[PDB]
């Protein structure tokens, strides 16, 4: 219900990055869980703007995903969770990453 016991079920080494060829996008990466109740069907990735009660979760075949449709120069919290035949398990150590507005030259 509410209680929670941190376990290996969830992934590790959560490192959020940004595509140098895509704006308002966040590439969340992680590692496989040390162990799992059963065969891992997939990995869900939930994200929400530091200032917004709206979390968006999506399915990811690999150990990473690409969260597009985001605001540049804005703190975004990402979190991955290992899914099993049953359902979603513990949530990985949520991480924060500040987006950027293009990684090009500076002219004005």
Swiss-Prot record:
Outcome of swapping residue 38 to D: In AD; uncertain significance
Annotated glycosylation sites: 63, 90
Tissue spec: Highly expressed in brain (at protein level). Most abundant in the cerebellum, cerebral cortex and occipital pole; low levels in the putamen and thalamus. Expression is significantly reduced in the frontal cortex of patients suffering from Alzheimer disease. Also expressed in spinal cord, spleen, testis, prostate, ovary, thyroid and lymph nodes.
Domain Fibronectin type-III: 10-102
Protein induction: Up-regulated by morphogenetic neuropeptide, also called head activator or HA. Up-regulated under hypoxic conditions in hematopoietic stem and progenitor cells, a physiological condition encountered by these cells in the endosteum. This up-regulation may be mediated by HIF1A-induced transcription.
Cellular compartment(s): Golgi apparatus membrane; Golgi apparatus, trans-Golgi network membrane; Endosome membrane; Early endosome membrane
Coiled coil: none
Processing and modification events after translation: Within the Golgi apparatus, the propeptide may be cleaved off by FURIN or a furin-like protease. After cleavage, the propeptide interacts with the mature protein N-terminus, preventing the association with other ligands. At the cell surface, partially subjected to proteolytic shedding that releases the ectodomain in the extracellular milieu. The shedding may be catalyzed by ADAM17/TACE.
Function: Sorting receptor that directs several proteins to their correct location within the cell. Along with AP-1 complex, involved Golgi apparatus - endosome sorting. Sorting receptor for APP, regulating its intracellular trafficking and processing into amyloidogenic-beta peptides. Retains APP in the trans-Golgi network, hence preventing its transit through late endosomes where amyloid beta peptides Abeta40 and Abeta42 are generated. May also sort newly produced amyloid-beta peptides to lysosomes for catabolism. Does not affect APP trafficking from the endoplasmic reticulum to Golgi compartments.
Other information: There may be a positive correlation of body mass index with levels of SORL1 transcript and SORLA protein in visceral adipose tissue.
Self-association and partners: After maturation cleavage, interacts (via N-terminus) with its own propeptide; this interaction prevents interaction with other ligands, including CRLF1, GDNF, GFRA1, IL6 and IL6R. Interacts (via N-terminal ectodomain) with APP, forming a 1:1 stoichiometric complex, including with isoforms APP695, APP751 and APP770; this interaction retains APP in the trans-Golgi network and reduces processing into soluble APP-alpha and amyloid-beta peptides. Also interacts with APP C-terminal fragment C99 and with Abeta40.
Protein family according to the UniProt entry: Belongs to the VPS10-related sortilin family. SORL1 subfamily.
Illness: Alzheimer disease: Alzheimer disease is a neurodegenerative disorder characterized by progressive dementia, loss of cognitive abilities, and deposition of fibrillar amyloid proteins as intraneuronal neurofibrillary tangles, extracellular amyloid plaques and vascular amyloid deposits. The major constituents of these plaques are neurotoxic amyloid-beta protein 40 and amyloid-beta protein 42, that are produced by the proteolysis of the transmembrane APP protein. The cytotoxic C-terminal fragments (CTFs) and the caspase-cleaved products, such as C31, are also implicated in neuronal death.
Name of the protein: Sortilin-related receptor
Origin species: Homo sapiens (Human)
Gene: SORL1
Positions spanned in the full protein: 1651 to 1745 of 2214
